[PDB]
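Reviewers asked in the last cycle whether our approach scales beyond single polypeptides. To address this, we selected a multi-component target totalling 1975 residues and predicted its structure end to end. The input consisted of the following lines:
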Amino acid sequence: VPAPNQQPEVFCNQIFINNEWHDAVSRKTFPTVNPSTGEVICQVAEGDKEDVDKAVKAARAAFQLGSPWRRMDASHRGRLLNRLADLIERDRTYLAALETLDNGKPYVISYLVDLDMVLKCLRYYAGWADKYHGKTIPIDGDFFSYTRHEPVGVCGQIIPWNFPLLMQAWKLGPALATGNVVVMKVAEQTPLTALYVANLIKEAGFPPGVVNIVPGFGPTAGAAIASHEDVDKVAFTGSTEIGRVIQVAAGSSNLKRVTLQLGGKSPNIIMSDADMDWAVEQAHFALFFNQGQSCSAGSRTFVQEDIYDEFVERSVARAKSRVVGNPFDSKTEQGPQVDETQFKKILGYINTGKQEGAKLLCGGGIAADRGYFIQPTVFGDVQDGMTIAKEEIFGPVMQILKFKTIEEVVGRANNSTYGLAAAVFTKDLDKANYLSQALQAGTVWVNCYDVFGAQSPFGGYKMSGSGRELGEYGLQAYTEVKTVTVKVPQKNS
Amino acid sequence: TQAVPAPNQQPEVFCNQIFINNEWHDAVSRKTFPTVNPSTGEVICQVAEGDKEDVDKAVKAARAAFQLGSPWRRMDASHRGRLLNRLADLIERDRTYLAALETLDNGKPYVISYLVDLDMVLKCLRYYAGWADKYHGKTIPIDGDFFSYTRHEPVGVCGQIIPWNFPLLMQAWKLGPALATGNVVVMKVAEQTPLTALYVANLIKEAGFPPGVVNIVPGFGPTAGAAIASHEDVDKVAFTGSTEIGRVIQVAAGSSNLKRVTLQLGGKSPNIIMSDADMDWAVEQAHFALFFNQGQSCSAGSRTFVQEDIYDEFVERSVARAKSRVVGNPFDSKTEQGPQVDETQFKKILGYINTGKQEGAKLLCGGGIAADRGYFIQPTVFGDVQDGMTIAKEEIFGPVMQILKFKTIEEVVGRANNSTYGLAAAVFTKDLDKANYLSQALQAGTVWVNCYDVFGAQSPFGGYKMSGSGRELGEYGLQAYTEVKTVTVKVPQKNS
Amino acid sequence: VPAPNQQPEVFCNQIFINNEWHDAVSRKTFPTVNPSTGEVICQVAEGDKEDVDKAVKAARAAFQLGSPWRRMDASHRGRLLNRLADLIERDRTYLAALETLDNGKPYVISYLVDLDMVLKCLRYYAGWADKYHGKTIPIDGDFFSYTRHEPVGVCGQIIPWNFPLLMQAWKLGPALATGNVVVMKVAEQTPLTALYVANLIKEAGFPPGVVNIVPGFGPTAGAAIASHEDVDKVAFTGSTEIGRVIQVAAGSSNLKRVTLQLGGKSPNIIMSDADMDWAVEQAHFALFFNQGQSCSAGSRTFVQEDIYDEFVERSVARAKSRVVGNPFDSKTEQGPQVDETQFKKILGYINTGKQEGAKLLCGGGIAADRGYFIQPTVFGDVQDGMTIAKEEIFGPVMQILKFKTIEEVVGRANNSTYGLAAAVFTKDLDKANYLSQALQAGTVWVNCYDVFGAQSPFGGYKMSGSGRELGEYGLQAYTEVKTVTVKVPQKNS
Amino acid sequence: VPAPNQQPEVFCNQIFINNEWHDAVSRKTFPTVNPSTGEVICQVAEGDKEDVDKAVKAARAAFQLGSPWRRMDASHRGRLLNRLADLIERDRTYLAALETLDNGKPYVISYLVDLDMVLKCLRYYAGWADKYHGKTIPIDGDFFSYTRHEPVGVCGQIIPWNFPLLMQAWKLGPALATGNVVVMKVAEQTPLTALYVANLIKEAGFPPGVVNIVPGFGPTAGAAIASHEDVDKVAFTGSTEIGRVIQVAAGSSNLKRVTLQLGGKSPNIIMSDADMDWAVEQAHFALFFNQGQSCSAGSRTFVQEDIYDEFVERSVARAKSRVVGNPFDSKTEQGPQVDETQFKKILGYINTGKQEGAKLLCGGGIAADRGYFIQPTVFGDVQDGMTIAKEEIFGPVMQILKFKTIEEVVGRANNSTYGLAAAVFTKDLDKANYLSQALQAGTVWVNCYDVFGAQSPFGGYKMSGSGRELGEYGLQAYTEVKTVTVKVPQKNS
Ligand SMILES: Nc1ncnc2c1ncn2[C@@H]1O[C@H](COP(=O)(O)OP(=O)(O)O)[C@@H](O)[C@H]1O
Ligand code: NA
Ligand code: NA
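The resulting structure, written as structure tokens, was:
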């Protein structure tokens, strides 16, 4: 990795509409903070309802029949996405540093993981631009019938702060591949990197109005998008509680299409026949990755009783050795949490676990004086009824539960209103096949964890969300299917 | 051959209760409600009035039949196909009976119930039976030493709420894809037309579907229907009906367990007649487009746009056709139009007709009540209709035709698209470029060219805008009943 | 299993054209023999070139634009296929008995396997009739581009004798689903059941000429179809030897489309961690099923050296216990071979096994005084270079080979010009994944064998064939893709 | 359009194997000529069987399990195809001139059409590299069944001289996207541009052996490919004559998989209600494009009797004004024919046309003293039974036929053993729909001609070929489908 600029300059901090930069109508700004220091990085235009209104009008205009964007060859949408990826890669080092500054994650990870996954996401979806065929259909009678795969239209996209660049990419990729237009609301904690990418969107040559980004707060800017009478579809990633607000707001306004990707309490199951070294390291990664701030974190580590003690001992050892510090320091494995709000929410869950009888094995406290750093925390002898075993913590807090039989762990892992991910570690062919089929989760990993690819869909069962992102499936929510049924003189096979 | 067997005009009712675990239950409250014959306005029988407690019992049954290792989960996908095919066979066995009961309860002409509704039900179930073992998931060439793939699982417990305009067909549109994909059902049928759907439940048991796979709770909307939309253990609701209630369905889902929602709502579909259309065909098709099923179709061509050069001719012919349209007893062979489904719709349509006269639309024929018994309305045609008129914007859902004049093709595109509805549209023209341009330009879920109301199980149906979300029929109608699971496995060495 | 009629009466023994029965033009007939007794069942019309020509004309006229078959709704093709299935299920015991009479396979197997698979194949493909969509395609420019999935046309279908009814179903299913017409040439060894199905095809209501069946010999009737100038497509199942003749004939005639399913020498691989009891019975079934007359037979049983001796001893014991006898007797597991030619060929390979030093562990001789019964035969210590280890025997003769490492057995299994099927028995996930990927075989079975379904495609790698049958894939060779590209006033997404 | 180098240098004229240049084993060379002058451009290594043998070994080795190419991420195969197109675009101006130098087509066309389509083809297929999913299949019983989409392996690719670079890209795109390796035989008339791309294939970073190119003659190098025992699949494009030879060699050797794209005699149908101006210009393009050297050329122009005289009148005027000259002169619409052999053959056909009673309306002779230039030639009053209305001329010779009715024109247009393309020009929706359905041709254009897109498949009905290239369909022939069926403890939906 190239040595980072530990204080990268900010070039974009305004509202992005029609390929131009605007202050908020109200002229208001809000500060974004460095989670490693607690210091203000800069101010950013505080978009609200009136700003969203302007973004939607611009998106609506670019989606007009006969416009440059509507008329553009599908294959050229691909060229543009590929160009956007090239421009992102050109500026990879700057963006990786900016991502760490605003979010707190280690710079090595921003560079090698986040930025790499963004490039791969955009390059993958570039390929889909001219391949998502409709159908010609053998209907009865003297008719020829077919479907057009058309864009859904103006798409509001509301994204979180845990993976700012990658969440932006996950949203823009499929939306732009299918010819939609976007009004994006980035997280108030991490607006900067997505604003810079907006400039690259312009540089890549996307028509004005095709992508519009409105930085600002949720109940203001986000709520305005979700309630807007001229937004055709909304895609939301965030908390389960705001997912309700979004869905309610859609039904209360114009019945716009909705998809959601929410939180989880994903079970990581370690059978007695698992490779212990690999299972311990993967279980550590499964929980602690990205400061524990992953919707798919394996926050319920089920370990079979015969290997429980050894697993726990090893897990505690690895958690005590996890390096917490300056995310720009290459030795650092764990940066700070994203903000003070999350910081406190995690301290409350830690205290909760102690009160309700969970066994604190290591960590459990504040790791430093400045910023929002928390010690890697491991709870043992966790029971299903416990709050730390039911609710998403979104911090470096690991729960280890013991089980006995394979049919028991099935019932206990499935006993949840969440269903985002799950994992099984075993060497047995039959146990893996039985578990992968039995687990009620959108993604099941066998002998691995947090393996994402732009090709394989991702999304939740139950209250972890609805619909899928990534892969071919990710195009479905961005398609309005039109049936054209034509009277013909004589139908033949 | 399209000949119809003489109907029993007073078909016996065998089923009038809540169907749960392949058995008939009274409402927990023991309360019942009357279903009425709209031809006379008189009660046919009492039906058990399912409420939230009855829905709870239905959902627990569905959940149990959906347990891993259950007969329905373990059943071969191909066998699900055979059960759907068996159910179709049974419905065909009782076709003459089912058609008559559909007419008794709903009001539509018997010849249509037999030749159209029952036919379409058969074709829909037989279509989706074939999908049972063909809706493949994928193996996916993901990066690295991994083998990744998707399982296409069922969503789970599916709440299904349907209207009264096509009681049997709406039931089939729901059960076909849901059962094909291995789901279980709690269905809430319209209070106006519960009977035929309940008799089909009897055939479901006879065909050998495991107990709890399909549960039907007859009853009212805000009671039974809302209990389903808000239930904490229903995974998915699919609703057909008014846009207004669709909102309620979506809010209830977000307010409860964030269940998956698909909707098929109302419309105000533009039927567009270019000056180069075949006049005779366009006239008869537009008449059918509006007046089909007593005007009680969500996709009715309730804005007939006619190019100015053929406006006068088209209107004269449409009025003549509407005047000759026979209204009467649906079991009578002469009848093209039966009564509206109930008194509420009856007065509601009459209300819209009055507004049409009020706003200056020319009443060209009909406009009133057609008989002093039942809910019959005269076939009504309004001419010189303008975009801002109430009858031009709101769904009437009755035999009331709006005819509007236009000049250019650019004009008619903007006017037809100027609607919060977008369920269907049509274009009548002989020109290749005009048909292609209009079919692409119209913001509607289904666009018909030189025809109208051409539905097929193979072709997807659903709305743009506020006419719904998602699609039914075809391969697409399986997407909402599928839960996709990605399985990603570490392998020793990935090779192409 | 309902009781059989061990002397079914024959209703059809002529040439089937335009739904009517015809004698051969030459009026010649040929005997078909009951392989259990060696007695002549009846005479069958001997179709040749002139008869094939009349069939091709019948088919060609049924395929003309505006004909009942071309105009028929796709869904109705599904109705007709389901009706034929119902008619076959009605006459199930009759056809299962006639299959056993003419072929030799046990009645219990004819009834429970062959006929059940026939019904499931036809009902599966009935579902496909109206679901094999073409595409609408986002081409560059102001154009609308789509594809029509039309039928390929007059299909010549040449089938073998090992699974007379099933092989017929495998051909008719996909061809009729997609609206093609058929000239079918059935094996001279087993013509009766297929000719009876023709009667049911008529009864079901298929239009005249949609299916035409010409019994007769290969070099006469078969070659006539293969070289025919008005046959658009040929599909052949049989020996690799004759596969070449088909492919040469097609190229020398009208360049008709060709798909082939040919022989095999399929490896069945038993790892030391396999379930012994299961692997032994399954290896036995893998080789011995259908009197060893299966293209996918596990004719190379590779066994890991740690379990070799135990596996061999158990296999020998199971082979010695395999009941040979009257196929109508409920206890018979193995009937006679199909005819004298096959009978002599199998004895020849057995002699070859002894001559080359393979260890004859049991069987090896003639098992009855009349008919074509051969003792269940097992060779041990088989080497890759032996003839019985290289060539397809198509009889109750088993080859057991010893191996040491997983990479050794991969190279050894793949060292063949055959590649139709393979199997792996193991409890280990990683081994199972590595082997299924490494093996160059059309179907790889894991902890099972000979598991077919109409849903999953089947066909060979290398010289075991080209193309696939069954599943959605089986529709590909029976479709002719037409692109329609239309100029439009203005292309919009 | 960038000013061309009228005499571009040749850097590559040898055999390409393992990313290295070789002389032929025989050390022999052959001349390639500039068809505009008749002068030799340079000598090219004359590959034969012995050289084909080295290429196959290199390809086979490159395709071995565990090789860099077999292990490479599917998405990365996409990066390589994109990189290859990037390099081709860098060298676009040079390649366009060299294409013109060796082929004779106008430089303006090479640059704007040929090179543009090459870039679009390669980039389209780069998108397919990680998206051509196999299936998970709901088979009966306690089993999990799925398909892997594997490469077919060593693919022999034999191409002609009419679109040298585009034919190469049509073959390489789908082959490399799906993980295959290639032994390509370019036409002796136009080897140079494909040889240069090979240089760029090395530079792009494709592993050695993945693409090997062998220049040389047909009956030597090409036959060696079709007859080779370690070539799994062959794709051929060229004459119907040689297509037969390829198929026979395939069936005679190792039963390699075969797909063909052969000649045509495509009907272009002008209804009386067609836009006269558009139809006249399109019909001119349909025939005369690329010096008449297109397999899909509209060489049967059917004009309705009511507009015949005017259409002919306007077509003669256009033909008479079509600029023949130096392909590097921007005003040139038609360069020379590819070589003296085609030159004489076309002149021969012209002689036949006059002899058989066709009415010569203009052209009919040589257009220059130097090179192989032919006057744009129009025959009127052409009848279906004339040699020039039946046989593929492959030159600037136009056939105009008169018809009365729709039914008549369907019969006459379909009365051909060719079926590659067709077109209908009409303003009427029903006529267009009836005709596009009734026409037995691989591609049907409506109110256009020769509209190709990498997204829409291309291939012939009848003896114009088998299988399809371009689009999703173009991946089918480059995929070997493997079914993996696994026994599971308990199958659930
Ligand atoms: N007998 C043959 N076997 C294999 N390939 C051949 C044979 N003859 C020609 N070819 C090759 O096939 C390609 C197409 O050639 P061909 O069909 O002869 O068209 P043309 O005759 O117009 O050159 C060329 O690359 C040529 O070298
Ligand atoms: Na920040
Ligand atoms: Na026989």
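DSSP finds 15 helices and 20 strands in chain B. We regard this as preliminary and will revisit it once experimental data from Aim 1 are available.
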